[PDB]
Design an enzyme around this catalytic site. Structure first.
Site, PDB file in Angstrom:
ATOM      1  N   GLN A  87       0.845  -1.176   0.000  1.00  0.00           N
ATOM      2  CA  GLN A  87       0.000   0.000   0.000  1.00  0.00           C
ATOM      3  C   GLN A  87       0.885   1.232   0.000  1.00  0.00           C
ATOM      4  OE1 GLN A  87      -2.312   0.872   3.487  1.00  0.00           O
ATOM      5  NE2 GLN A  87      -4.076   1.518   2.273  1.00  0.00           N
ATOM      6  N   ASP A  93       2.021   1.592  -3.514  1.00  0.00           N
ATOM      7  CA  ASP A  93       0.906   1.973  -4.346  1.00  0.00           C
ATOM      8  C   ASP A  93       0.636   3.474  -4.287  1.00  0.00           C
ATOM      9  OD1 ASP A  93      -2.083   2.547  -4.785  1.00  0.00           O
ATOM     10  OD2 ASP A  93      -1.800   0.542  -5.651  1.00  0.00           O
ATOM     11  N   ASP A 133       2.697   5.746  -3.515  1.00  0.00           N
ATOM     12  CA  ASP A 133       3.833   6.514  -3.996  1.00  0.00           C
ATOM     13  C   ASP A 133       3.640   6.605  -5.516  1.00  0.00           C
ATOM     14  OD1 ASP A 133       6.397   7.294  -5.074  1.00  0.00           O
ATOM     15  OD2 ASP A 133       7.429   6.526  -3.336  1.00  0.00           O
ATOM     16  N   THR A 168       3.349  11.653  -8.457  1.00  0.00           N
ATOM     17  CA  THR A 168       4.367  11.332  -9.448  1.00  0.00           C
ATOM     18  C   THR A 168       4.512   9.843  -9.723  1.00  0.00           C
ATOM     19  OG1 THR A 168       6.322  11.088  -8.054  1.00  0.00           O
ATOM     20  CG2 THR A 168       5.597  13.313  -8.475  1.00  0.00           C
ATOM     21  N   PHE A 223       7.112   8.167 -10.490  1.00  0.00           N
ATOM     22  CA  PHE A 223       8.374   7.556 -10.081  1.00  0.00           C
ATOM     23  C   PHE A 223       8.352   7.013  -8.667  1.00  0.00           C
ATOM     24  CE2 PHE A 223      10.195   9.298 -13.828  1.00  0.00           C
ATOM     25  CZ  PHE A 223       9.618  10.543 -13.979  1.00  0.00           C
ATOM     26  N   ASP A 277       9.633   7.550  -6.077  1.00  0.00           N
ATOM     27  CA  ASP A 277      10.420   8.653  -5.530  1.00  0.00           C
ATOM     28  C   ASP A 277      10.102   9.134  -4.124  1.00  0.00           C
ATOM     29  OD1 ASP A 277       8.056  10.008  -5.689  1.00  0.00           O
ATOM     30  OD2 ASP A 277       8.566  11.160  -7.500  1.00  0.00           O
ATOM     31  N   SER A 312       7.230  10.244  -2.999  1.00  0.00           N
ATOM     32  CA  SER A 312       6.350  11.394  -3.033  1.00  0.00           C
ATOM     33  C   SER A 312       5.246  11.300  -1.999  1.00  0.00           C
ATOM     34  CB  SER A 312       5.749  11.564  -4.429  1.00  0.00           C
ATOM     35  OG  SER A 312       4.963  10.442  -4.801  1.00  0.00           O
ATOM     36  N   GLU A 318      -5.869   6.868   6.246  1.00  0.00           N
ATOM     37  CA  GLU A 318      -6.957   5.995   5.864  1.00  0.00           C
ATOM     38  C   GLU A 318      -7.102   4.813   6.848  1.00  0.00           C
ATOM     39  OE1 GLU A 318      -6.691   2.875   4.154  1.00  0.00           O
ATOM     40  OE2 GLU A 318      -8.875   2.779   3.904  1.00  0.00           O
ATOM     41  N   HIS A 336      -6.018  -5.476  -1.854  1.00  0.00           N
ATOM     42  CA  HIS A 336      -7.237  -5.476  -1.059  1.00  0.00           C
ATOM     43  C   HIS A 336      -7.575  -6.865  -0.523  1.00  0.00           C
ATOM     44  CE1 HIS A 336      -8.665  -1.553  -3.256  1.00  0.00           C
ATOM     45  NE2 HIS A 336      -7.511  -1.425  -2.632  1.00  0.00           N
TER      46      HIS A 336
HETATM   47  C1  HEM Z   1      -6.519  -1.759   5.083  1.00  0.00           C
HETATM   48  C2  HEM Z   1      -5.910  -1.583   3.838  1.00  0.00           C
HETATM   49  C3  HEM Z   1      -6.481  -0.760   2.792  1.00  0.00           C
HETATM   50  C4  HEM Z   1      -7.604   0.081   2.799  1.00  0.00           C
HETATM   51  C5  HEM Z   1      -8.605   0.386   3.987  1.00  0.00           C
HETATM   52  C6  HEM Z   1      -7.725   0.644   1.496  1.00  0.00           C
HETATM   53  C7  HEM Z   1      -8.720   1.549   1.035  1.00  0.00           C
HETATM   54  C8  HEM Z   1      -8.756   2.043  -0.238  1.00  0.00           C
HETATM   55  C9  HEM Z   1      -9.793   2.970  -0.855  1.00  0.00           C
HETATM   56  C10 HEM Z   1     -10.975   3.511  -0.116  1.00  0.00           C
HETATM   57  C11 HEM Z   1      -9.494   3.251  -2.074  1.00  0.00           C
HETATM   58  C12 HEM Z   1     -10.119   4.070  -3.187  1.00  0.00           C
HETATM   59  C13 HEM Z   1     -11.065   3.194  -4.006  1.00  0.00           C
HETATM   60  C14 HEM Z   1     -11.629   3.986  -5.151  1.00  0.00           C
HETATM   61  O1  HEM Z   1     -12.644   4.766  -4.787  1.00  0.00           O
HETATM   62  O2  HEM Z   1     -11.162   3.911  -6.300  1.00  0.00           O
HETATM   63  C15 HEM Z   1      -8.226   2.475  -2.383  1.00  0.00           C
HETATM   64  C16 HEM Z   1      -7.663   2.574  -3.635  1.00  0.00           C
HETATM   65  C17 HEM Z   1      -6.543   1.906  -4.039  1.00  0.00           C
HETATM   66  N1  HEM Z   1      -5.903   0.956  -3.259  1.00  0.00           N
HETATM   67 FE1  HEM Z   1      -6.356   0.562  -1.327  1.00  0.00          FE
HETATM   68  N2  HEM Z   1      -6.718   0.159   0.745  1.00  0.00           N
HETATM   69  C18 HEM Z   1      -5.969  -0.689   1.488  1.00  0.00           C
HETATM   70  C19 HEM Z   1      -4.885  -1.411   1.114  1.00  0.00           C
HETATM   71  C20 HEM Z   1      -4.379  -1.404  -0.137  1.00  0.00           C
HETATM   72  C21 HEM Z   1      -3.272  -2.214  -0.551  1.00  0.00           C
HETATM   73  C22 HEM Z   1      -2.596  -3.203   0.546  1.00  0.00           C
HETATM   74  C23 HEM Z   1      -2.983  -1.999  -1.838  1.00  0.00           C
HETATM   75  C24 HEM Z   1      -1.920  -2.573  -2.797  1.00  0.00           C
HETATM   76  C25 HEM Z   1      -0.963  -3.558  -2.498  1.00  0.00           C
HETATM   77  C26 HEM Z   1      -3.904  -0.998  -2.351  1.00  0.00           C
HETATM   78  C27 HEM Z   1      -3.911  -0.514  -3.645  1.00  0.00           C
HETATM   79  C28 HEM Z   1      -4.847   0.483  -4.020  1.00  0.00           C
HETATM   80  C29 HEM Z   1      -4.820   1.156  -5.301  1.00  0.00           C
HETATM   81  C30 HEM Z   1      -3.919   1.026  -6.497  1.00  0.00           C
HETATM   82  C31 HEM Z   1      -5.921   2.096  -5.315  1.00  0.00           C
HETATM   83  C32 HEM Z   1      -6.287   3.077  -6.487  1.00  0.00           C
HETATM   84  C33 HEM Z   1      -5.305   4.258  -6.277  1.00  0.00           C
HETATM   85  C34 HEM Z   1      -5.519   5.365  -7.380  1.00  0.00           C
HETATM   86  O3  HEM Z   1      -6.431   6.232  -7.114  1.00  0.00           O
HETATM   87  O4  HEM Z   1      -4.774   5.401  -8.471  1.00  0.00           O
HETATM   88  N3  HEM Z   1      -4.763  -0.657  -1.263  1.00  0.00           N
HETATM   89  N4  HEM Z   1      -7.875   1.808  -1.254  1.00  0.00           N
HETATM   90  O1  LIG Z   2      -5.864   4.491  -0.318  1.00  0.00           O
HETATM   91  C1  LIG Z   2      -6.893   5.134  -0.338  1.00  0.00           C
HETATM   92  O2  LIG Z   2      -7.568   5.684   0.722  1.00  0.00           O
HETATM   93  C2  LIG Z   2      -8.070   6.913   0.319  1.00  0.00           C
HETATM   94  C3  LIG Z   2      -9.294   7.564   0.955  1.00  0.00           C
HETATM   95  O3  LIG Z   2     -10.224   6.646   1.467  1.00  0.00           O
HETATM   96  C4  LIG Z   2      -8.919   8.727   1.861  1.00  0.00           C
HETATM   97  O4  LIG Z   2      -8.636   9.978   1.235  1.00  0.00           O
HETATM   98  C5  LIG Z   2      -8.162   6.720  -1.150  1.00  0.00           C
HETATM   99  O5  LIG Z   2      -9.022   7.361  -1.928  1.00  0.00           O
HETATM  100  C6  LIG Z   2      -7.218   5.886  -1.530  1.00  0.00           C
HETATM  101  O6  LIG Z   2      -6.675   5.713  -2.756  1.00  0.00           O
HETATM  102 CA   LIG Z   3       5.963   8.915  -6.816  1.00  0.00          CA
END
Ligand code: HEM
Ligand SMILES: O=C1O[C@H]([C@@H](O)CO)C(O)=C1O
Ligand SMILES: [Ca+2]
Ligand SMILES: *[C@@H]1O[C@H](CO)[C@@H](O[C@@H]2O[C@H](CO)[C@@H](O)[C@H](O)[C@H]2NC(C)=O)[C@H](O)[C@H]1NC(C)=O
Ligand SMILES: *[C@@H]1O[C@H](CO)[C@@H](O[C@@H]2O[C@H](CO)[C@@H](O)[C@H](O)[C@H]2NC(C)=O)[C@H](O)[C@H]1NC(C)=O
Ligand SMILES: *[C@@H]1O[C@H](CO)[C@@H](O)[C@H](O)[C@H]1NC(C)=O
Ligand SMILES: *[C@@H]1O[C@H](CO)[C@@H](O)[C@H](O)[C@H]1NC(C)=O
EC number: 1.11.1.7
Length: 595
Positions: free
Chosen positions: A105, A108, A110, A184, A186, A188, A190, A258, A351
C-alpha cells in the site's frame, strides 16, 4: 496525425537542467519530454478507453444499454456473490508478514492516485448522492441489489463520485475521458514529501535550517516524532471519535490516515528522514537546509526503491519476476515511465491481502492491554488509537509478528472492507471497497478481462468451460458466468484477481504481466533510479545495498528484536534476532570534506 496537448494541468514547467534532485512534481525527469511521469497529468492508456458511449460515460450508466449484448452486473451484486465470505479462520498467509500487505500500500500510494472530483462540493448535490441516490454527472451511485441486507439499513445505494479527468472538471464531448494521476509516477517517496510544491513546502521545517521535516507539536511518541496534524476541519479522524478529537495526520500523500497501519508506516518514514538529516548535519555542518533536506530525500527514495525491487516485487511476482523485470540494464529515456490506468486497478490485488484485525504487541510481543486486537474497520481514519493508546511500537510489532491475509478464490475481501468501509464525507462504516473497485473500473473506462488477457498474450476463454480452466475453479467460473454473461464482460479487477497465483508469487498470470511491465517501466524510465550510474557513488550505492526494513524499525522505534527478513512469516522469538546485529546504514560515503 493527432494532438500533443490538451489539459488543464499544465502549470509552469521551467526545468533546471543539470540539477541533482528530482522536482517535487516529477517534471524534468525526462529531458526529451519534461512532463512524463509528472504529477497531475492523465494516466497513460495502454489500451483505448472503453466507455458505454465511446467517450466518457461508464458501462452500467444507462439501464437500457448493454456491454457486448449483456448487462453489466451491479457492482455490489458481484461483490456479494463473489468477493465476500464470513469465516476468517484459515485465511492467513503462512509466508507473508502483515508488512507484506502494508508495503504494497505504501508503494501503491507513492505511484498513483486518481481522486474523486468536486464541482457540487460544499453543496448537497454531493450528499444528494448519498441521500436521494440519483445518478447524474459525477454522482454515479452504487445501487444495492434485491436481496442486499444493506437495503434494510442503509438506503437505496452507497454514494460514489467519479474520478477527476483531464482538461475540465465537467463537460466531455470531443475526446475519450482520461483520469488524472495526482502524484508522481516515479518510485520517488512522493508520499513522504508531496507531489505539489505547495504541499511539499508546508510539510518541511523552515524554522531551523536543519533540513528537518516538520513534526507534530501537540503530541510526541516516547520522545519520537509524529506527523503534524492536518489542521483541516471538519476532519474525518476527529469524526470517528469526537471525544478523542484527534485529527488526521498531514503527509506527502493525502491518504496516510486511511487506516492506522498506513499512518504507522508514514511515521517510520518521516522519522527516517529526520534521522537522516541529523546524521548528515553531524557529518557535514557546511551543508545547508536545502542540501540536508535534498540529500535525505534522495536517500529515502533510494530506500523505498531497493526494498520494493529487491524485497517486495520478487515475492509478489514469484516465478514471473524475471520474465518481466530482468537485470537493470541502465536508465533508458525512451521508456514511458507513466502509470497506466489499468495498473491502478491491478495493484489493488492488495485489497485481498488485508486481514480482519490489527494487533498491538508489547516488548514480549504479547497482546498489549485488554483490547489488543481490534477489528480492522474501527481503525479507518483512526489516529487516536496511536496517540492516546500506545504509540506505534505495538503496531509495528504487530506488522512483523502477524501475517497478511492470503488471497483465496472462495474468500476474497474481508467484510471489514466489504461491508464496513468508512469513507470521508460520509458518516457511516457501511461502504464496500470491492463494489467500489468495480464501479471505478467502469468509471475509468477500463476494457474487459479478455482484452487484457489478449494484451498480455494469454488465452481468451469464451465459454464457461474455458473460464474454469483458466481460473482452475468450476464454482467461481459458474458464478462469474451467471453474472457477466461472457468472460469478455468480466471487470478487470475481479478477473485479474480470480486467477490462481503463479508459483512463489501472490498474483496470477494476467496480474504478473500487468504489474511486471509497470514496475519495469518504473525502473528503466527513471533518470534518478538509485543505481543509474551517476546519481550515487558506488561507495554510496554499496552502502545502500545494506538497507533492511529491519534497520528502519530499529532506528525509528523502541523495539530491540526484529527478523532478518521482514516480509516472510516470522515467529517470536525464533525468527527474531537483535537490533544490535542488523547491518546499519553507513552514511560515511556522504561525507563531503569539500567545504
Ligand atoms: C486496510 C488496507 C487498505 C484500505 C482500507 C484501502 C482503502 C482504499 C480505498 C478507499 C481506495 C479508493 C477506491 C476507489 O474509490 O477507487 C483504495 C484505492 C486503491 N488501493 Fe487501497 N486500501 C488498502 C490497502 C491497499 C493495498 C494493501 C494496496 C496494494 C498492495 C492498495 C492498492 C490500491 C490502489 C492502487 C488504489 C487506487 C489508487 C488510485 O487512485 O490510483 N490498497 N484503497
Ligand atoms: O488508499 C486510499 O484511501 C483513500 C481515501 O479513502 C482517503 O482519502 C483513497 O481514496 C485511496 O486511494
Ligand atoms: Ca511517486
Ligand atoms: C523545527 O525544529 C526545531 C528543533 O530542531 C523545533 O523547534 C522547537 O520547539 C520546541 C518545542 O518542543 C522548543 O523546545 C524549541 O523552541 C525548538 N527546539 C529547537 C531545537 O530549536 C521545531 O519544532 C521544528 N519546527 C516545526 C514547524 O516543526
Ligand atoms: C474515542 O476516543 C476516546 C479517547 O481517545 C476513547 O476513550 C478511552 O477509552 C476508555 C474509556 O472507557 C479508557 O480505557 C481510555 O483510557 C480512554 N482514553 C482517554 C484518553 O480518556 C474512546 O474509546 C473512543 N470512543 C469511541 C466511541 O470510539
Ligand atoms: C517463504 O518465502 C521465502 C522467500 O520469499 C522462501 O525463501 C521460503 O522458502 C519460504 N518459506 C517457507 C517455509 O516455505
Ligand atoms: C530503450 O527503450 C525502448 C522501449 O522500451 C526500446 O526500444 C530499447 O530497446 C531500450 N533500449 C535498450 C538498450 O534495450
Amino acid at each position: 496525425s493527432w494532438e500533443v496537448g490538451c489539459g488543464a494541468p499544465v502549470p509552469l514547467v521551467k526545468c533546471d537542467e543539470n540539477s541533482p534532485y528530482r522536482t517535487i512534481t516529477g517534471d524534468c525527469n525526462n529531458r526529451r519530454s519534461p512532463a512524463l511521469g509528472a504529477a497531475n497529468r492523465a494516466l497513460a492508456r495502454w489500451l483505448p478507453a472503453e466507455y458505454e458511449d465511446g467517450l466518457a460515460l461508464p458501462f452500467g450508466w444507462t439501464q437500457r444499454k448493454t456491454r457486448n449484448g449483456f448487462r453489466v452486473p451491479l457492482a455490489r451484486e458481484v461483490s456479494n456473490k463473489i468477493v465476500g465470505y464470513l469465516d476468517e479462520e484459515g485465511v492467513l498467509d503462512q509466508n507473508r508478514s502483515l508488512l507484506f500487505m502494508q508495503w504494497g500500500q505504501i508503494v501503491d500510494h507513492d505511484l498513483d492516485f486518481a481522486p474523486e472530483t468536486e464541482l457540487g462540493s460544499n453543496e448537497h448535490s454531493k450528499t444528494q448522492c448519498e441521500e436521494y441516490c440519483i445518478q447524474g454527472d459525477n454522482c454515479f451511485p452504487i445501487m444495492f441489489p434485491k436481496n442486499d441486507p444493506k437495503l434494510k439499513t442503509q438506503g437505496k445505494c452507497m454514494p460514489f463520485f467519479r474520478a477527476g479527468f483531464v482538461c475540465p472538471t465537467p463537460p466531455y464531448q470531443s475526446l475519450a475521458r482520461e483520469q488524472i494521476n495526482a502524484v508522481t509516477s516515479f518510485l520517488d517517496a512522493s508520499l513522504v514529501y508531496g507531489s505539489e510544491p505547495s504541499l511539499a513546502s508546508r510539510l518541511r521545517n523552515l524554522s531551523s535550517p536543519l533540513g528537518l521535516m516538520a513534526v507534530n507539536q501537540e503530541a510526541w511518541d516516547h520522545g519520537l516524532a509524529y506527523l503534524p496534524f492536518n489542521n483541516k476541519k471538519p476532519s474525518p479522524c476527529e469524526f470517528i471519535n469526537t471525544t478523542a478529537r484527534v485529527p488526521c495526520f498531514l503527509a506527502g500523500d493525502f491518504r496516510a490516515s486511511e487506516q492506522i497501519l498506513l499512518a504507522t508506516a508514514h511515521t517510520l518514514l518521516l522519522r527516517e528522514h529526520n534521522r537522516l538529516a541529523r546524521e548528515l548535519k553531524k557529518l557535514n555542518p557546511h551543508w545547508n537546509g536545502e542540501k540536508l533536506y535534498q540529500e535525505a530525500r534522495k536517500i529515502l527514495g533510494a530506500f523505498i526503491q531497493i526494498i520494493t525491487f529487491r524485497d517486495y516485487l520478487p515475492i509478489v511476482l514469484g516465478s514471473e519476476m524475471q520474465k518481466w523485470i530482468p537485470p537493470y540494464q541502465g536508465y533508458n529515456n525512451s521508456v514511458d515511465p507513466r502509470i497506466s490506468n489499468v495498473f491502478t486497478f491491478a495493484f489493488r490485488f492488495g485489497h485481498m491481502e488485508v486481514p480482519s484485525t490489527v494487533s498491538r504487541l508489547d516488548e514480549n510481543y504479547q497482546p498489549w492491554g485488554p483490547e489488543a486486537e481490534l477489528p480492522l474497520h474501527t481503525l479507518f481514519f483512526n489516529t487516536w488509537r496511536i496517540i492516546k493508546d500506545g504509540g506505534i511500537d505495538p503496531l509495528v510489532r504487530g506488522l512483523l509478528a502477524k501475517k497478511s491475509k492470503l488471497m483465496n478464490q472462495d474468500k476474497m475481501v474481508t467484510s471489514e472492507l466489504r461491508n464496513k468501509l468508512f469513507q470521508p464525507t460520509h458518516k457511516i462504516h457501511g461502504f464496500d471497497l470491492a463494489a467500489i473497485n468495480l464501479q471505478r473500473c467502469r468509471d475509468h473506462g477500463m476494457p474487459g478481462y479478455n482484452s487484457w488477457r489478449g494484451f498480455c498474450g494469454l488465452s481468451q476463454p469464451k465459454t464457461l468451460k474455458g473460464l474454469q480452466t483458466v481460473l482452475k475453479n468450476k464454482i467461481l467460473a459458474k458464478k462469474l458466468m451467471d453474472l457477466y454473461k461472457t468472460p469478455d464482460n468480466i471487470d478487470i479487477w475481479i478477473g485479474g484477481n480470480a486467477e490462481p497465483m503463479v508459483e512463489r508469487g501472490r498474483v496470477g498470470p494476467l496480474l504478473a504481466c500487468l504489474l511486471g511491465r509497470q514496475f519495469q517501466q518504473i525502473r528503466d524510465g527513471d533518470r534518478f533510479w538509485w543505481e543509474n550510474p551517476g546519481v550515487f557513488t558506488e561507495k554510496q550505492r554499496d552502502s545502500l545495498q545494506k538497507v533492511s526494513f529491519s534497520r528502519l524499525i530499529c532506528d525509528n522505534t523502541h523495539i530491540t528484536k526484529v527478523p532478518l527478513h521482514a516480509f516472510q512469516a516470522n515467529n517470536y522469538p525464533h525468527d527474531f534476532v537483535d537490533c544490535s546485529t542488523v547491518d546499519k546504514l553507513d552514511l560515511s560515503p556522504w561525507a563531503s570534506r569539500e567545504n
